[model samples]
Target: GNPLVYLDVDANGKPLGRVVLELKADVVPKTAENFRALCTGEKGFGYKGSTFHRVIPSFMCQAGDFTNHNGTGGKSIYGSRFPDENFTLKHVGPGVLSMANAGPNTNGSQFFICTIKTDWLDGKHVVFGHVIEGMDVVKKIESFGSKSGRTSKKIVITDCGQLS
Candidate 1:
């Protein structure tokens, strides 16, 4: 079954909105499971209060970095990096959810939501899910980040969970 994840955040002193994602467990089992476990607060770690540390207009918005809001540090439910679950799914359009890693097979708690077509990153990242709702919120966030990718307005994931 597809698992839904809800992200609650505030932007510019107002309630941003809920960003909902539907995990593609049927295709990317391992990657999706990792995200689902994190959403469920597995091992006492979850997406709650995490910030969308990086955002670029016409690109994607990055987040799920529970350890460090700077996108430099993060941990998985297993407490370490895991192999990639890269499948046939491509980052063809906006709202695609993908794992954010330093290199190959470094899937962890970090992930990003594509706000534009990023086909060049197709095989390099795990596209485990996509936004089922809240594209406007994602776009709203994309418009606030700096040219360097750092968000000018704080974008926090106030809460998250599996909606299976």
Candidate 2:
């Protein structure tokens, strides 16, 4: 029931602790696997050097774009853009993890974690997981953001991988 992953983050070149995510592999196998594999770097290209390109205070922090480091880049392990798995999970509140895309079924490596109830994104984004622990680190990351989603300092995933 718990396929876990972790992102050890840094901001302004300093450590900010970790954010652990528990995946809903049972509901979103391919989607969860995409995130999981990206975490472990099983794929040659992965989330290792990714920066949280998009961040909004009281909202979400988005990352997983290892290619471009901005919102404009990244792809799936399937070698191209992949389709959404489903919308079984809801973005009810904080720490909810989901995909970020251009439109329908445009899921890539990009993802975001909610810092509050983001129910508006429930159907549009595929909710595959949530922060099981270390949400304080997420809050610390959130504090570095502004209303325009611009980070005052760079929030980076310094290290990341699957947890058992």
Among these predictions, the greatest TM-score belongs to: 2
Q: Deviation in angstroms for 5 in model 1?
A: 1.4
Models 1 onward score TM values of 0.95, 0.97
**Model 1 ranges off by over 4 Å:** none
- Tens-place lDDT digits, model 1, residues 1-164: 77887887777557888888899988988888889888878668888878889998989999988887898888887667988866578898999999999999887788999988899998899899999989999999999887799888988887788777
Off by over 4 Å in 2: none
**What are the per-model numbers of colliding residue pairs?**
0, 0
For candidate 1, report its TM-score: 0.95
What digit string (tens of lDDT, one per residue) describes model 2 on residues 91-162?
999999999999999998999999999999978999999999999999999998899888899888989998
lDDT on C-alpha atoms for all candidate structures: 0.86, 0.91
Residue 145 in model 1: shift from native, Å? 1.0
